[PDB]
Write a protein that binds this ligand. Structure first.
Ligand SMILES: Cc1cc2nc3c(=O)[nH]c(=O)nc-3n(C[C@H](O)[C@H](O)[C@H](O)COP(=O)(O)O)c2cc1C
Length: 106
């Protein structure tokens, strides 16, 4: 998993708290530009709203999902993101983070 971010769903709007070096390369953002923000900044005009709903539902249900959707780099370059979400639970079985892995399928 080279490109990924980890979010903290115990903080408001599930902000990114960690972004891998490859993710920065992929997306053209600096670490400072994106930590503390929700990963939906990757979306834009052509991102399929139905697929986003599929992600929203998986987050709500706290389950794994793999979808493919149009994302955008900082300059506004489109790419096909083969995206996999995974809930991560602590030692009490309580939701603790989400990991999001991106694969540029373009
Ligand atoms: C860890 C994590 C990684 C995510 N990575 C992406 C991503 O790479 N691309 C994307 O379009 N959305 C990604 N999302 C989803 C958005 O953050 C958001 O959950 C999605 O747009 C659905 O929720 P919303 O309707 O409130 O926008 C990620 C979410 C989480 C929690």
């Amino acid at each position: 998993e080279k490109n990924f971010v980890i979010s903290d769903p115990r903080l408001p709007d599930n902000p990114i708290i960690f972004a891998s070096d490859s993710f920065l390369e992929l997306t053209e953002y600096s670490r400072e530009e994106i930590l503390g923000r929700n990963a939906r900044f990757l979306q834009g005009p052509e991102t399929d709203q139905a697929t986003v709903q599929k992600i929203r539902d998986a987050i709500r249900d706290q389950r794994e999902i793999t979808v493919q959707l149009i994302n955008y780099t900082k300059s506004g370059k489109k790419f096909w993101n083969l995206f996999h979400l995974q809930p991560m639970r602590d030692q009490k079985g309580e939701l603790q983070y989400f990991i999001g892995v991106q694969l540029d399928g373009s």
